[PDB]
Amino acid sequence: KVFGRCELAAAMKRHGLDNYRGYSLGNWVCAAKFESNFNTQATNRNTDGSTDYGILQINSRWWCNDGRTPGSRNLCNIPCSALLSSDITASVNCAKKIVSDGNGMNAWVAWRNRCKGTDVQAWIRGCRL
Incomplete structure (x- = not known):
């Protein structure tokens, strides 16, 4: 599913992303935009x-299992295909673990290079909202 800007903002807010670990909703919508184009x-x-999956392009080396990444750690304990669902709950739950990992939103290269420090x-x- 290709989300609309405001539609996604509202789904993420409902899922508790607004201000999670100090990151305002705008950060998450910006990251999704440049990571997957809301797809x-x-x-x-x-x-x-390894491969990146879904709306927030979560990597298979550490976060999910796709059955084809030698050494993957599957920290979110889910098959990577779950991250491609129209329901963003899994992508959101996993993103919460990733952002709490110590390096915050820098974990997402597009966020760091295209959202960080922007309005x-x-x-x-x-x-x-």
Whole structure:
């Protein structure tokens, strides 16, 4: 499913992401935009052989099991395919563990290079929240 900007903002808010670990909702919507373009079905393989899954492009080397990443740790205890669902609950639960991992939102390269330090508020502007 390809989410709309405000539709996603509201789903993430409902799922408790707004201000989770000090990161305002605008940060999460901005990261989803540049990570997957709001598409839950997005996947991208990396040079190391692992793959990134879904709306928040969660990596298979550490967070989920896709059955084809030697040494994956599956810290979120879920098959990577679960992260591609139209229901974002799994992606959100896993993202909460990732962001609490010590390096915060820097874990997402697109967030770091394209959202960090920008007016992330603009991403939720105009939405009924």
